[PDB]
Symmetry: D3
Subunit: 327 residues, 6 copies
């Protein structure tokens, strides 16, 4: 496959070229805004990489890659509204810069624009793309609802948590890879194998996000360190920490304090104290083990793909780099 | 074609049978709720009527008919949020019964469920259905944004108003008819002719809604009489009324008072006084003329369709009944 | 027994004489205010009537009678806060005239002042008075909590409703009568018999309040007609109405609309429509039957009391007058 | 007397055993919650110590000791509502964890449960317990109202401040000791002597709390340092500081700034600057002198009690330990 | 003097000609808006009438007449903000159409523009105009503050009420007349005589407004009937009504209910009931007597002015017409 | 001229003596409060200095000097309301200590009191004082509106910014000097020359305030460092910084974040980062150059005044000291 940097450069050129709606501005200005917040564009690049590895061009896969990115950004726009997020990537969220009604309607327009980007494909690929895309989009809705339901549950199991993050953050990784495979004309059995890789990669990636939310390096315009702790989100780190009967009661008591009932200094003490319980309980290590375990499962999936050994080496290195390890 | 009553009965059976997602309840309970608020189901029945007239069965068109209804209800769910509507058809809106975040996410899930209802069609019809559906859905978003933009404009032309209501309320009428024609295997030229009928019908229907909002018979759990007046919506009735230099200045002055700066009795006096200006200006008659004119255009479209004369008589009668006239 | 009018006159003299705390004004001004809102003073007069019937004087029972009234008013003060009531007996509630913190603290001071009014009794009666008073006060708290719990339950049984109104409104009727009996030196078996009368009377009285809330004559500064309907309170009238499978579904649908999602006219239509369902279902008649049935049970209790036949005739007439019937 | 640690251990066992109401949970769950927030339980242990010193057992005094603690916690529950406190002892307040209406009603239920804990005593002690308890409870209400009244007064005298803290925080110390003496069968003259000790101890203790609010060691989940300063509470420390005509004008000017008109850094500068004025004015020393003076008065009261010299040594040491001094 | 209608016509021409500032629009657009709300322009026309009667022209007095109107409108702009008025003369208030900050700043600009309209006068008249204008403007501020102070007083005397309405509404009537006299070159003794007429006229006019607020004919876009009653304003009508010991207690009790604690129907019942107390107490008649009495005092002032008997007849008729009587 | 310190001492004596209105307290208490917040009283002292330099006494100019200070404080009172300022000079703003309505009405009373302080001047000076005062006051209103208009403009030129700060902060400096010259009997040509000095001085002074807002030394009860940055005020520092095409895009992006969408730490990072862009762009130096340039223009104006060379040396030194330079 081409280098990430080469694919990203082509991708950002083709994005500007294929997303051109401008009028009415009240609808489309926020689409250009959210697509211009930058970053790694991991999801669309999985589509291009999959395509190349299986014999097609980036150029062939490009409209589908752009659908994936438009879709993902549609989810961020509605999610920022539902989560009352003020900033995304150091910039105002769409509903803050404009208004909530703009966020609702523009996000709706982006989901539809994503579907439209499939229309240049032949009838057979068009059908296959729409089918895995729609199943994935509806799964992402279910994952969102599960995550909301967990907010008022005091009894969430690790299996239920892994099912939720699979639907909410991993199926679209699978889907992005599967779409490149569809464009290359690969069969269903092969499509499912690359999909499965995407599931294990996506689960490792999200478990890593759970870990770094608590233990990650602070960035002022980056993700707040200890946001999950402050908001009492029951992530893999917390769920594993409370399996230890020594820490469980005083972890549950920290997770009973709302941040609106607390001063800055109380919130910071809660983050330092809960971080220490995460280490001492074995929860932090159990989280690093689960990330390691999903990454290995993803590497074994790569070994079984019908792609050239170069392609497996590139994918194996990309997977290790994504998980902050070295090649 | 079968009778409306026969099609509606089959439609409500097939709706219950084909929309079965139940878990998670936080996502899908509101889908069953909004689909159970009743009424005429005009849009899906246009799909079934189109199908029958051109040779297919209701049963063949049914999944597409249900897509149309799921789509329309998705738009009502987001619209009720954006318009802060408390009631729909005498019952609490989804965002009032549940919450705004439920309305946002459930509406997203309904748009995706609509797309999925195309999946049993052959690859050729699947392609055609998705294409006219997506273009229609994005047009409905544009119409919504235009209607929002008109709120802060003091200078809206009749042409701009007719373009907005075409996108917001008529293209989906066209689309519902065009989808039945696609299922019957009709060609693009014929599909566009039935689409065009739907445009003229949909414009007549919406101009009728503008008229009845001011002059309609009061229903307590029905549409408020004078809601457009209270909210200073610049509808066809107002736009034509202000063409009269005798009424224009004191109509613009009534339309400058926000209802939040007014007592009940002031609002009622504003409605009675503006209603009288609508009559005396010629605006009310000009609105009835435009409804009459669009209805005639729709009747001429029916005369040119490639359908049996029975089918034209049934459609001609359905069009007159819809516009509160007699056969 | 003396006439109600004679007892009430003595009672209001002794009230002014025995509740004299004035400083600090921020605490005690609201006590004088709430005790001066007038009405029938039913509860304290039951204490005086019980005392006389069993051989003691009004004067002997007076401090205990005043405790009962101070207690009852303490409950109204906290209840007006918890129910967000703006007016009581045509005048501002304590928390509206002053503030919520005044309502909380003054109500606390009134409960304690009630207990103190027992202190002139001999050690034996003091003990008995405190014991039935405290059990009654804690039962009234439980009844309040049950009524709150019923707000979020869709499944309340008639037995659970009768248990709630017994605790919330009837045990204090029983208690007021039992306290007069204690002051007259009557034994526990007799005390319980008059208590039981008070339970049946209190249940009849509250079932009558449920009936008149819907069907009572309007008083502008009196209880709103249809308040229970507007607030979707599941009272005996509603619980019996929904036993009719013909009315049940559209009663439950009316009871799903919050009044904050409705206009005045929608609220008035809901009250007229639900009132009609109450009649047509058999719920209204079943409510009048239950009032009749509790009143008869109370009359039989009177026949078994150890009091002079005069005393039974006076009590029998008082019971019928209270229930808006004739002697 | 037994050791504090031994009495506390027995007390927490007997508390769990004698406070068993669980249904309805909406009423009683918050009672178990507030009684489980831990700490020294000073007030109930004064009751047990008094009992032992005068010849009775802890076991005899236990129900009365538990009444004292239930009473005190009832006051904290209403006080946390009226003061808008978010946390108590590092945990959410009842009105934050549940709601305000829960706090109002559960607190009412706790006052009544306290009264009920007297019922196992003989009629003579029952009478005496209820009488000093009720007088104390009503005095605590008056002290609360005085403290509220001082918020809008610019003219509060040291005598008026000492009278307020006596009613609000000291009479219950007196009362707790007096109740143990009543259970031991001691006479009124002796009961008043131990009561008086409790008054002087309670005044020393509260003057110490005034001192430590400004000058105490910071605890993140403990009492905020400088809360009285931030809220402009006119405590003994401020009242003595303004007797100095050199500091008075700029102290009154600091005490004119609301914390809602200030940034964190302004609040911290106000606390550092006012703390310095407290030292330099002589106010801090005058506060330490008043604590010393009340402690000595309490020690002289101990010398005059009719108890064994051991008992006086234990009480003398307990008094010095409470005031953060050594034996 | 010219007819009111002739003076008003010249006045509205000269207003448009002499108030021409347009940029920046954010400052001056609201000046044109508030000056275009129409009505009788009584105050400026008093200036023109005074001028003519004493020998000058309307044209000479015009800039001063316009100052008076600009001043009066400046007071209405700030008053509408402070009173939270939504409408003025059937149109949105400046702070509702724009914002509060616009109302504050534009009103400030209008006071200054008023002062500037004196600048074409000779140095002697300029001095005299500025002096009576400034004293009047500061008196109007004092009257406003007194009216605010009366809101929290339960003890307002008729003398204090008459002093307040003199400052708030009458001194500017006096001032407008005095300014015309200054322009005609009249001496101080004569200027004070016409001023005094204006005081008695202005007091009659305001007492009439107090009367008509309760008893006036309803106009939907006019002054609310019973606004003073709803807002518990202690006007001459209420102050005289409570002199009757028969009505006083239940009038004070009606005047204790805030309209925010009341339903529409309670407010309407309060207005009907208080109106009846106003009649039956003698308060309504005492108000008509005071209006009659001030009008007669004004007529006697006219008899003593140094003007032609025509001028006295015109002024006498104008005074009677203003008070809704006939010539 | 006398020393600043000598003039300030006389000024504060004469202020206390000439501003004596006390009743009603609700109107005048806030006038005494805002005039007692201290500082340099630059503006009134310019009036006294101008008077002395041209031959009059301080005593002659004093009433006009006090008008200037009363006027300036009137503007601060309304400005603190419109800007929602909580503190002024370390003390609560008038609208926070009292209320907004007090701020509106008291500020109105202060503008009128200012005008009244001209009344002891002879008719010729009275006329000249009123005329330059009123033109200045109306210009200050226009400058305020321009500054408000700039909040919603993305396109503000340096010329438009300099025009706004001239009207908002410099014309009153000119005016204060011109009034002293009028009192000394100087001619219009000379009056305009001292006015012009005041314009250049006032522009230098305000450009210095723009500079020190970003780069000034922090004072806790002083002006917040980086307030203009936090509020995205487009001051000379920002306008010059964005002329550099290297910094412009990321400066505009920082200036797009509202502080309500940011944490403390994000605000502090924004201030540090924007401060660095101000230096590196050349904007900071260009601001120091413009201050230097206006100061030199002011020094040249001093050289051309018709005053004694002493007077020019004193004024030259005062100008350099004001701009934080040395003599
Ligand atoms: Mg994200
Ligand atoms: Mg997540
Ligand atoms: Mg609709
Ligand atoms: Mg519409
Ligand atoms: Mg009641
Ligand atoms: Mg009830
Ligand atoms: Mg505490
Ligand atoms: Mg305290
Ligand atoms: Mg008016
Ligand atoms: Mg008035
Ligand atoms: Mg300033
Ligand atoms: Mg500025």
């Amino acid at each position: 496959m081409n280098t990430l940097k080469s694919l990203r450069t082509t991708f950002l050129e083709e994005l500007k070229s294929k997303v051109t709606a401008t009028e009415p501005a009240g609808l489309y200005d926020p689409v250009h805004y959210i697509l211009d917040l930058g970053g790694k564009r991991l999801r669309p690049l999985l589509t291009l990489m999959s395509a190349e590895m299986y014999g097609a061009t980036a150029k062939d896969a490009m409209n589908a890659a752009i659908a994936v990115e438009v879709f993902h950004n549609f989810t961020l726009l509605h999610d920022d509204i539902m989560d009352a997020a003020d900033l995304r990537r150091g910039k105002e969220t769409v509903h803050k810069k404009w208004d909530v009604n703009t966020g609702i309607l523009t996000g709706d327009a982006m989901l539809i624009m994503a579907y439209r980007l499939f229309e240049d494909y032949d009838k057979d690929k068009f059908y296959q793309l729409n089918k895995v895309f729609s199943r994935t989009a509806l799964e992402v809705c279910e994952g969102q609802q599960h995550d909301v339901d967990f907010e008022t549950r005091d009894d969430v199991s690790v299996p239920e948590y892994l099912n939720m993050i699979k639907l909410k953050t991993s199926v679209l990784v699978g889907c992005a890879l599967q779409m490149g495979a569809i464009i290359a004309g690969v069969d269903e059995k092969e499509q499912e194998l690359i999909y499965d890789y995407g599931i294990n990669l996506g689960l490792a990636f999200q478990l890593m996000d759970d870990y770094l939310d608590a233990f990650g390096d602070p960035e002022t315009f980056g993700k707040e360190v200890g946001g999950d702790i402050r908001e009492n989100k029951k992530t893999y780190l917390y769920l594993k920490s409370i399996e230890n009967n020594d820490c469980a009661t005083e972890l549950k008591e920290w997770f009973a304090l709302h941040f609106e009932n607390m001063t800055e200094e109380q919130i910071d003490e809660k983050k330092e104290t809960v971080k220490v319980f995460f280490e001492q309980s074995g929860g932090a290590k159990a989280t690093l083990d689960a990330i390691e375990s999903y990454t290995q499962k993803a590497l074994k999936n790569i070994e079984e793909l019908s792609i050239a050994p170069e392609s497996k080496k590139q994918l194996t290195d990309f997977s290790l780099q994504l998980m902050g390890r070295k090649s």
